[PDB]
Design a binder for these strands. Structure first.
Length: 284
RNA sequence: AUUGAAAGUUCAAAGCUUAGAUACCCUGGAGGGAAACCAGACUUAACAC
């Protein structure tokens, strides 16, 4: 119902790790995309909904539609700040998940290699995925049932494989990861954030001026507020296999490829990671 | 005016009976939601002199 929508911001502020962030952002996107309408005596006349203060601020009393536009921009920034502040990491379910999965893989007689990597700068993984896409035009790869951002197993595998190509040749890359005729020997799980020092998300901006622009006459900043993954967030994922003589390349490839980027726009130093730990458990 | 003349190969009769398109068979293997992008531009007006 509509009261769900008028209260979604309060619910974000008061649950902070226990609401579905995916659906929460999807719902508050309706508020963001009907902002001018949710501010015509249709705030349910509450007292905690952040929609109140946008009746108290007078940004432009001359023209009301401009006023609603500026209020909407302020509200976009405020939604970004809200999500970054309130939605924090509780990575105990993640440690439980990875420990149980490790036991499962041990029972299946796999050699497990559990890798912990910490982000060093603000990371962008899944920038074209849907999360905040309907508010920010930019997304984060988000698992809506772990209720966490994550790094897909396919990206980790692809980055490791492109490095192993660039180093040991396409033939060894196919001897490890397979081709259209043989299946790979190395399995990757998704990477989930297990611990953090502070905020899990933070706001950021990109402001292209001269992107696909003829001349300075075409120049104009178009700022893009969006969410990123805060620094010092540790992610964890597993690497399991059976054939022993495939652990050597993996071992070598992990420390290097994380220094270079792992998500989006690493060319300007965004998605850089440190190797926090690597443990190897040989099936005995 | 012939080793001739005359004489229906005819009658009755079900290609039926029993019989499973079934058995074995992973939509799988390979594949980075990435690439590009300045949170920036600029002071103006009024009167006094």
């Amino acid at each position: 119902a509509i009261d769900f929508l008028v209260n979604i911001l309060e619910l974000i502020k008061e649950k902070q790790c226990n609401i579905n962030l995916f659906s929460a952002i999807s719902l508050t996107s309706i508020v963001y995309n009907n902002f001018g309408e949710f501010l015509s005596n249709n705030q349910s006349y509450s007292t905690n909904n952040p929609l109140l203060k946008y009746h108290i601020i007078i940004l432009n009393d001359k023209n009301k539609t401009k006023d609603v536009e500026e209020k909407r921009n302020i509200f976009k920034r405020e939604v970004a700040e809200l999500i970054s502040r309130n939605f924090k990491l509780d990575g105990e379910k993640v440690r439980n998940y990875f420990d149980s999965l490790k036991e499962v893989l041990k029972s299946l007689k796999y050699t497990i290699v559990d890798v912990e990597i910490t982000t060093r700068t603000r990371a962008l993984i899944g920038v074209s995925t849907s999360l905040g896409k309907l508010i920010f035009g930019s997304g984060i790869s988000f698992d809506p049932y772990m209720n966490l951002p994550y790094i897909p197993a396919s990206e980790i595998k692809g980055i490791v494989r492109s490095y192993i190509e660039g180093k040991l040749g396409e033939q060894e890359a196919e001897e490890i990861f397979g081709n259209e005729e043989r299946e790979g020997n190395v399995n990757f799980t998704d990477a989930y954030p297990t611990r953090s020092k502070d905020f899990l998300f933070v706001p950021d901006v990109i402001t292209p001026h001269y992107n696909g622009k003829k001349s300075e006459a075409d120049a104009e900043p178009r700022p893009v507020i969006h969410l990123t993954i805060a620094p010092k967030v540790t992610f964890r994922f597993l690497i399991y296999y059976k054939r022993e003589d495939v652990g050597k390349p993996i071992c070598d490839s992990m420390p290097i490829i994380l220094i270079r980027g792992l998500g989006a726009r690493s060319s300007v130093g965004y998605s850089l990671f440190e190797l926090r730990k690597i443990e190897v458990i040989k099936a005995a």
